[PDB]
Amino acid sequence: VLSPADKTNVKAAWGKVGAHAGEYGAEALERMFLSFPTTKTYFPHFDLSHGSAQVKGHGKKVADALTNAVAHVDDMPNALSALSDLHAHKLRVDPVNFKLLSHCLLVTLAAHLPAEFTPAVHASLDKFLASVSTVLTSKYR
Amino acid sequence: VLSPADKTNVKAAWGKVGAHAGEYGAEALERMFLSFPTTKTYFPHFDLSHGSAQVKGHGKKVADALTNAVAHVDDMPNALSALSDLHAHKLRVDPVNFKLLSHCLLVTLAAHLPAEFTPAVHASLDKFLASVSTVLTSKYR
Amino acid sequence: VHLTPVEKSAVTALWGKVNVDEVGGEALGRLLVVYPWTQRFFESFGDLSTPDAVMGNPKVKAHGKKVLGAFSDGLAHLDNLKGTFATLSELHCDKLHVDPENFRLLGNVLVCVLAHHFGKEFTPPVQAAYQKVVAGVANALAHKYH
Amino acid sequence: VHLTPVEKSAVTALWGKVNVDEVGGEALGRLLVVYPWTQRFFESFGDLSTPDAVMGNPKVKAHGKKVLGAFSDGLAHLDNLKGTFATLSELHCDKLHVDPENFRLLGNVLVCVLAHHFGKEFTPPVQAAYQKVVAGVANALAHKYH
Numbered sequence: 001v002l003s004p005a006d007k008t009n010v011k012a013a014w015g016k017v018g019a020h021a022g023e024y025g026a027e028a029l030e031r032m033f034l035s036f037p038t039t040k041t042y043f044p045h046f047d048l049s050h051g052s053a054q055v056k057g058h059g060k061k062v063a064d065a066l067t068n069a070v071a072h073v074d075d076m077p078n079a080l081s082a083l084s085d086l087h088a089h090k091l092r093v094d095p096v097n098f099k100l101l102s103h104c105l106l107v108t109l110a111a112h113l114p115a116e117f118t119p120a121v122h123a124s125l126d127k128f129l130a131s132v133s134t135v136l137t138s139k140y141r
Numbered sequence: 142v143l144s145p146a147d148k149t150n151v152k153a154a155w156g157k158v159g160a161h162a163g164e165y166g167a168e169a170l171e172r173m174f175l176s177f178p179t180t181k182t183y184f185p186h187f188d189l190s191h192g193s194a195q196v197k198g199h200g201k202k203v204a205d206a207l208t209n210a211v212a213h214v215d216d217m218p219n220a221l222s223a224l225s226d227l228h229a230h231k232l233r234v235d236p237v238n239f240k241l242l243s244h245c246l247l248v249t250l251a252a253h254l255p256a257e258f259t260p261a262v263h264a265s266l267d268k269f270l271a272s273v274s275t276v277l278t279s280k281y282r
Numbered sequence: 283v284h285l286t287p288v289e290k291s292a293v294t295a296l297w298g299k300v301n302v303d304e305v306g307g308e309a310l311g312r313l314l315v316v317y318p319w320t321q322r323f324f325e326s327f328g329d330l331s332t333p334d335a336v337m338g339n340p341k342v343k344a345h346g347k348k349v350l351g352a353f354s355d356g357l358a359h360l361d362n363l364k365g366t367f368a369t370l371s372e373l374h375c376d377k378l379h380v381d382p383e384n385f386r387l388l389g390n391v392l393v394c395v396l397a398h399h400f401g402k403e404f405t406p407p408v409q410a411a412y413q414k415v416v417a418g419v420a421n422a423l424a425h426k427y428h
Numbered sequence: 429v430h431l432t433p434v435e436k437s438a439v440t441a442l443w444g445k446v447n448v449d450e451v452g453g454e455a456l457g458r459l460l461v462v463y464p465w466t467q468r469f470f471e472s473f474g475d476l477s478t479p480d481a482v483m484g485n486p487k488v489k490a491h492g493k494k495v496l497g498a499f500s501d502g503l504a505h506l507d508n509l510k511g512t513f514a515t516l517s518e519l520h521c522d523k524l525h526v527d528p529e530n531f532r533l534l535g536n537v538l539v540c541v542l543a544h545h546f547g548k549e550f551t552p553p554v555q556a557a558y559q560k561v562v563a564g565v566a567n568a569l570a571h572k573y574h
């Protein structure tokens with residue numbers, strides 16, 4: 001559950017990602033695939049090589065969904081409804097994989113926006129991605 | 142994130158508790174302390190002994206707390222903010238302990254309410270108890 | 283895992299009442315219903331579309347009896363659960379890549395199933411003994427992750 | 429997954445640039461901030477009630493140093509990590525009873541803190557190597573739970 005400060009932390013931190021959202025999505029992705037090779041079994045139809053166009057495109061999708069989660073942080077379950085059907089019903093992703101991807105997203109952000117990645121902002125972002133993960137892995141339809 | 146069915150299951154399963162609210166609450170308590178002794182470290186002021194009137198009185202509160210959480214499921218954070226501040230702010234309960242108590246509550250329910258403990262209801266209670274666990278371990282106000 | 287002679291006697295007496303043809307299937311079925319992502323490891327089992335479908339699925343029951351059977355072998359080899367499960371650890375960890383958190387889940391599901399079946403007979407002390415066991419078994423499954 | 433010669437070179441390369449009297453303090457301090465129940469293990473350490481309070485607490489920085497030093501040891505002794513942390517495992521597991529998931533979290537916070545400092549130098553491939561290392565320290569650290 002996000003506090004008032006969490007919410008403001010996340011929105012200002014995200015706004016600083018700016019036009020790099022898609023780029024940060026793809027880097028978090030690459031980091032996860034290299035750091036955690038088991039997560040690759042979820043993308044058997046993806047070209048997963050370095051510089052892959054498929055990974056770059058997917059990163060942008062993930063970034064755009066996170067952006068929309070930021071826009072809709074007070075009613076995320078409704079805003080993310082279609083994404084939870086995909087991830088919870090059809091794919092049935094193991095929640096541990098969302099912790100891996102969230103960690104890689106936090107590594108990307110700390111690498112690219114060091115002055116934004118204060119301890120407090122670190123915590124707020126960690127809770128936000130945990131909240132997104134719960135919604136996407138929960139069957140609530 | 143609970144589905145419509147989930148809240149109906151949790152309402153329909155936990156309601157059958159009713160009178161025995163203290164009884165099942167105390168038993169899941171005892172189940173936790175015997176099965177997972179480290180959890181006693183949060184209760185050095187209690188009389189841990191079997192049938193301890195302090196454990197029994199406690200049981201009655203967790204259960205009403207849970208009935209209260211069943212009562213305000215769709216605004217649990219507001220409805221639980223006082224328990225949140227107790228367990229997250231002042232007591233610093235590591236979240237694993239909530240999984241242990243949640244397991245022992247499911248066991249107690251399965252032992253005492255077999256006709257209600259269908260697979261579907263078990264899935265709903267597990268999510269409901271995970272939901273209470275997140276709210277109770279989050280600092281949000 | 284070290285049980286006392288007393289929890290040893292009470293665990294073994296309960297287990298001697300277990301319906302060896304159903305309890306395993308109930309534990310697996312519930313795992314798949316309660317933790318739906320575990321369904322990904324069993325795509326070749328057919329209909330897993332609803333809870334009633336899961337619990338009635340004949341392959342689910344079939345594979346449940348096999349899993350119940352390993353928990354039996356462990357119960358007679360509480361000493362070196364690591365060895366007794368060395369090969370099985372090979373499978374789930376090296377071959378199958380099962381995140382070891384799921385081993386804890388199935389043991390706790392199985393604990394819920396024994397409670398369901400035995401009611402007040404599944405007392406707090408009794409469950410405490412079984413928790414020791416399924417903690418032991420899950421440990422020996424994740425031995426190769428170790 | 430064990431270390432191949434290329435990443436061995438890669439990680440030790442940037443571990444040398446690490447400042448050994450801060451990052452440890454930021455890793456522990458961020459663990460206490462991001463995962464606050466861990467504070468419970470430090471009521472002796474005094475004021476931890478706000479981030480800035482945590483991140484400058486001399487206790488925290490002090491404690492951090494020896495944790496980073498502990499990590500340096502594991503680096504020097506990858507081929508046998510559990511021996512290295514045998515004693516540490518005993519204190520954390522047998523004495524304090526720290527849930528081992530908390531170990532994994534601290535390793536990931538350290539990895540975050542390396543990213544914060546080294547920026548672009550902390551490439552995906554260098555993270556991949558380090559993730560192997562921290563998972564070794566967390567596993568070695570909980571060996572007595574196994």
Ligand code: HEM
Pocket residue numbers: 039042043061062063065066083086087091093097098101132133136
């Ligand atoms: C921050 C958390 C995540 C977000 C916001 C997210 C978002 C998305 C989005 C936006 C899509 C595209 C939906 C569409 O094109 O219709 C997608 C598809 C997908 N996601 Fe996720 N995801 C997340 C975590 C994960 C994780 C951890 C995994 C697996 C390890 C995963 C696996 C997949 C897969 C396999 C697809 C199908 C893509 C395809 O077939 O092209 N997601 N996800």
Ligand code: HEM
Pocket residue numbers: 180183184202203204205206207224227228232234238239242273274277
């Ligand atoms: C479903 C999970 C839980 C619920 C619903 C719950 C509910 C409650 C309630 C209603 C109270 C008393 C509120 C009052 O003072 O009126 C309480 C107190 C307390 N709870 Fe929890 N609790 C849960 C989990 C836990 C766990 C996992 C622990 C520790 C392992 C814990 C430790 C405590 C302690 C130490 C107190 C102080 C009680 C007292 O001094 O009266 N709780 N809880």
Ligand code: HEM
Pocket residue numbers: 320323324348349352353370373374378380384385386388389419420423
């Ligand atoms: C925790 C205790 C567990 C025990 C005692 C156990 C036991 C077994 C046994 C006896 C077999 C069959 C070996 C054979 O006949 O050759 C097996 C295979 C298998 N296990 Fe489990 N298991 C456990 C947990 C899990 C979990 C949690 C999962 C997935 C989430 C899993 C997935 C599988 C799969 C996919 C197979 C092979 C299925 C196939 O190839 O058709 N196991 N396990």
Ligand code: HEM
Pocket residue numbers: 466469470472494495498499516520524526530531532534535565566569
């Ligand atoms: C995961 C990697 C970890 C490493 C490498 C590590 C390392 C160490 C070392 C070297 C000490 C020496 C203290 C002494 O000599 O008395 C220590 C103490 C301690 N550790 Fe850790 N530790 C780790 C994780 C954790 C975690 C996650 C927690 C709690 C959440 C924790 C709680 C403590 C406490 C409370 C002490 C002693 C406090 C005191 O001396 O006042 N440790 N640790």
